[PDB]
Design a binder for this molecule. Structure first.
Ligand SMILES: COC(=O)c1c(CN2CCOCC2)nc(-c2nccs2)nc1-c1ccc(F)cc1Br
Ligand SMILES: COC(=O)c1c(CN2CCOCC2)nc(-c2nccs2)nc1-c1ccc(F)cc1Br
Ligand SMILES: COC(=O)c1c(CN2CCOCC2)nc(-c2nccs2)nc1-c1ccc(F)cc1Br
Ligand SMILES: COC(=O)c1c(CN2CCOCC2)nc(-c2nccs2)nc1-c1ccc(F)cc1Br
Ligand SMILES: COC(=O)c1c(CN2CCOCC2)nc(-c2nccs2)nc1-c1ccc(F)cc1Br
Ligand SMILES: COC(=O)c1c(CN2CCOCC2)nc(-c2nccs2)nc1-c1ccc(F)cc1Br
Lengths: 146, 145, 144, 137, 154, 154
């Protein structure tokens, strides 16, 4: 069969995204609510807008199909299967496209590495708070970023 | 949020629903066909086109539905996946693969011609379906389907 | 272990030939009979003639080896037909057809037929596309 | 039927390989290992490379088919393939003319009674051995 | 026998890495995942790239041998206590050494030798200061300044 | 996981080294003793010296950790059979991979990569030739000519 990595045309890979642990990601429900609040009109547009919009439109819809299936299930372990296992895959994909629309690919990728490194540092030995996803500087007390 | 997956491609869910189920190839035949025609483009690091970007996600979505059916009482679930969700994905995968091969304008014209032909009573219509192609058939000016 | 695809030096792959359903292919016997009728003297020649001739000569002989073994019950015959037999039908056809029509025509035809056969029968033209190099044309020369 | 001799296009014959006795040839496994150590990248290449490469690819694959089926064959089939693999891999390494010469040198050596012949076999190589004008095997 | 110190050609020593306590270091698994995320393509490269890359490549493979060994024991050892004593030795006792070495190379590739060595000292000194008398947070490994409220670093 | 081939940066591969049969290689102990006798000083040096020296230094230490483990098993495991199965696994199975790697590096430091790779193929072909049909003696690893009775090598 075909080997398509959904991240590849966007300068990333499944493996890279797997560097982030599951509890880094917002829930599917909150990712969907965020795409709407930020991008509802672009997403509903007749224009492509960008490859990230095209790709995020299909993800949203696919999740819908998986949920429409769980909801049909339906009328427990199957429903759990969807929300647990399939859940993580969609959390990573929806987070990836929505964050790239917002902060751009370079920042997103830089952030995935920062957080992935921070979370793997023993808590007693690391800064108390996680690095901040942002395009804007924090600077020294030259602009500095996360 | 109401996203029609066809709308950025100049079509709509209702338009595609003009075609009855058995017009479409099987999901398995669409997937073999995407691979025979487009595997390298689909697998590449270049966007290539919006249809490629979309076709890649559909393949993978079906994959999640089929990795679900494989992960799976068992019948109603599998039959739901393959039949109903099934029809949606037949439309969607046929639409992109046909657009990449014949271009949007031909695909949309074809949808309408086939949809019209199949609704004509069999005894009153031409014996064979219109033919999807970009190439002329012509008079006995070039004439297409 | 080596990973050798016998179609690779000829511009194709195993997965490409796999797009054709088994019932597209002539039988092994009919394929061998056809190689002989068209190519017996070039295949029996001391000249290489071409890479296709070289590979076709080995395929023909390998089949002979496989048959001597397989005749050494109809569980064994259906496995052969389903697996080894199909492999050699694809391989023998590919080589004899490329010698006859050139690689480009054959590869085009592979895709035409595998697309046609996957179109629902009630929705598709009644006859298969035709393998030849010569035009059919409108009622620009148009080929299959 | 077709009477096809797989050595014919390469300037030899089935009869000519038969002049070497079975125990001259390396095993099929050692022959496959050697094709891989020496030629794997040419063999896995999208380029024909040469007629010997083309032929060698098919032999390597044919042997696999024989084993895959048989797992789902030694005194006859095995020797035929030892001959054919050896021939192609040797020609790619030393050229046809050397391999054909060596063929005849060893087959004459091995047929000379042991107490009457040199203790060691002639050596397959392209490079001279010489007198104590270059002399080869 | 030879007495080779693996840190020596990189300007450190075994004793200096021992100035850091064990729970300073990320787990082996997290170190491996980090090497990959930051350096997979270089590590898998045909080019040497640097001496740290060469050394790192070896350390990742040596760990892999120890893992294969622990799995093998899991499979092939019939006694539970034995299988468990052996696997625990690898993961804990041997793990600590590799935690130090993988950390060392991956940090050097990221921040440079000078910074890493400075950091080793800073952390080691901070952890041994009584908690009530020291800054609440550990020193921060980076190459970038924090600065006064001249650039100041950790 | 990453897939690092320890030979790749040095112009070979695991599969190529696998062309040599196990009984071609000196014992681990004899390799270690040869490393010491030829290269102890460079190996214990503060200088990188060469990419081969860096990797050899690690392989030597990795084996060291495997030996320490074998010995630990000696003291810390009760069941005679479990102990012995672990010890033979290290010496025999893991030992083969280290014989390949240590030989490879020490040989490359001595004769250079090109000579070593040529030798690898010559021996591998020789040992696969039926003994009654091949020269009585193996090909000889050296950089120096043997010549005809232009210089000729192995
Ligand atoms: C448009 O999306 C965002 O802005 C966004 C953000 C922005 N953060 C800035 C710092 O404060 C927290 C939110 N952060 C983060 C994360 N940080 C840590 C783990 S995830 N992800 C996204 C985001 C947040 C919540 C959400 F529901 C969807 C997204 Br996408
Ligand atoms: C490339 O690796 C790193 O960047 C790295 C860091 C970077 N820190 C910056 C400040 O926040 C925590 C991480 N910190 C530290 C440590 N700090 C205290 C104890 S260890 N080590 C490395 C690191 C961290 C996690 C990891 F999995 C691998 C490494 Br290497
Ligand atoms: C030399 O080989 C051929 O000429 C050839 C042909 C030619 N066709 C022209 C149209 O009528 C049917 C034969 N067709 C085809 C096919 N068409 C559909 C499926 S296979 N294959 C080859 C061929 C045919 C029969 C045969 F025994 C061997 C070959 Br090779
Ligand atoms: C790349 O895809 C195609 O070319 C294609 C075609 C082309 N037809 C030409 C006339 O003969 C039948 C095939 N026809 C048709 C249809 N016609 C009627 C109903 S569907 N769809 C596509 C197509 C066919 C089979 C398939 F598996 C995938 C596709 Br996409
Ligand atoms: C630096 O190491 C060597 O020089 C060396 C040699 C050199 N040979 C020269 C001819 O006589 C035998 C040794 N031969 C060989 C081999 N030959 C055949 C199979 S292995 N390996 C190395 C070598 C030999 C012994 C040893 F303990 C370590 C090495 Br490395
Ligand atoms: C690449 O293949 C070879 O080089 C080769 C050789 C070379 N010989 C040189 C003298 O020492 C023995 C090997 N010898 C011989 C023979 N000699 C006597 C009987 S067979 N055949 C080939 C060869 C050897 C081993 C093998 F596994 C494959 C081949 Br092909």
């Amino acid at each position: 069969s075909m080997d398509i990595d959904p991240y590849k045309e966007f300068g990333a890979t499944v493996e890279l995204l797997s560097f982030l642990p599951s509890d880094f990601f917002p829930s599917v429900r909150d990712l969907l609510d965020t795409a709407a609040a930020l991008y509802r009109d672009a997403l509903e547009s007749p224009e492509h807008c960008s490859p990230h919009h095209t790709a995020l439109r299909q993800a949203i819809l696919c999740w819908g199909d998986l949920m429409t299936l769980a909801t049909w299930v339906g009328t427990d372990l199957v429903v759990s299967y969807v929300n647990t296992n399939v859940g993580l895959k969609f959390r990573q994909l929806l987070w990836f496209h929505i964050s790239c629309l917002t902060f751009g690919r370079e920042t997103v990728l830089e952030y995935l590495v920062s957080f992935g490194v921070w979370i793997r540092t023993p808590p007693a030995a690391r800064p108390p708070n996680a690095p901040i996803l942002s395009t804007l500087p924090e600077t020294t007390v030259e602009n500095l970023y996360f």
